[PDB]
Amino acid sequence: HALVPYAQGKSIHQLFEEQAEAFPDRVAIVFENRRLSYQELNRKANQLARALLEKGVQTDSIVGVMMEKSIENVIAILAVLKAGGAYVPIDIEYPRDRIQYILQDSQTKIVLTQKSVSQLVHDVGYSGEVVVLDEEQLDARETANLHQPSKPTDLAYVIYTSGTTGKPKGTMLEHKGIANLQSFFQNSFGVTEQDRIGLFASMSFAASVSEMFMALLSGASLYILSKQTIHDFAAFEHYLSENELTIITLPPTYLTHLTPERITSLRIMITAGSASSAPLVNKWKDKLRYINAYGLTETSCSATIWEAPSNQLSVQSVPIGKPIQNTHIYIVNEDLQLLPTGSEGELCIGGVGLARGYWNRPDLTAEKFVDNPFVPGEKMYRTGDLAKWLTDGTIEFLGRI
Ligand SMILES: Nc1ncnc2c1ncn2[C@@H]1O[C@H](COP(=O)(O)O)[C@@H](O)[C@H]1O
Ligand SMILES: [Cl-]
């Protein structure tokens, strides 16, 4: 039994199926002028999951996804999880050679795409199975849940990232971190089925996975923001306002361009990926609940939060806060010795959100995902981030070691 309760023993798609059973007629997903209910979304994913099972998708199958941000991309993701596999979202705007390297590194034998992306799949020369989902004839297939065997330690998704230099690498994420996040978001952000959540991040990026499941594992609605909507700050404000969106996660670099008087309905603004200035926090923290979230691809996108304390004077600095439920974080020196208040060292993260490691990168995995000496038999991730404890028990982010 976990320190903080969550839906232990459950896969991502099982938690989604429970929401589709409880809230069948609520709106699940919106893109432009189209929307699906939970029941509609679940049925379509089950029809596709049975097709993918017939093609050989099984536990720890890595299934490439080369698709636009769309309702059909979400159907594909849910279908891969229900068939028992794991998906790798491939950024279709990347140069050809980067897509080629990712597909080759991943060793994926099956890629899901759409008609508008088929020519790119041909041009990067992929020689495995290609499923053109908007040519697939699925309407006759059974719409019931599959109930395939699954364990929360099974792979769910693989996210590729490239450093300044270094080859793209795949971070392997299991279901368990996203199951814990469902509990975290309900407890700490009060997410309910009433919420209307924007999908901002590229569906290549680990943050997108977090955003998508923030909605779909609570019965809330997910509004997939279009390229045009994100590109124009006025259009972005109008879209949020007209659709009464209640929660969004943004890079602070984007939030900087927005006008609080132009967003009607948000109850929470989360910023992630980089630091928010104190002036940016002061501009927003009395209009809504401002949350600074610190987390990594390697930790299921989550580690710590700092919600700006409500009804307070201005702040002159912006902590990254405290570890979230069922996660551990340590500030250590180069010898992995714990540091007292005020001493800067490396953030190391442990607990349920930790990736399995890097795909086919055993020495890098061993270097980064080290034995947790504080909790025998667990691992912890060496972030490369510098931080210190404040004596109030919050963490200050200081940059890179
Ligand atoms: N709230 C934050 N404040 C400052 N840096 C952050 C924050 N959240 C994420 N980061 C940085 O982004 C990295 C994770 O990048 P990624 O895995 O691409 O999400 C972390 O190791 C930090 O360097
Ligand atoms: Cl089940």
UniProtKB/Swiss-Prot annotation:
Coiled coil: none annotated. In the first step of peptide synthesis this enzyme activates phenylalanine and racemizes it to the D-isomer. Large multienzyme complex of TycA, TycB and TycC. Tyrocidine is a mixture of four cyclic decapeptides, tyrocidine A (D-Phe-Pro-Phe-D-Phe-Asn-Gln-Tyr-Val-Orn-Leu), B, C, and D, in which Phe, at positions 3, 4, and Tyr residues are gradually replaced by Trp, depending on the relative concentrations of these amino acids in the growth medium. One-module-bearing peptide synthase with a C-terminal epimerization domain. Each module incorporates one amino acid into the peptide product and can be further subdivided into domains responsible for substrate adenylation, thiolation, condensation (not for the initiation module), and epimerization (optional), and N methylation (optional). Belongs to the ATP-dependent AMP-binding enzyme family. This is Tyrocidine synthase 1. The chain holds residues 18 to 418 of 1088 of the full protein.
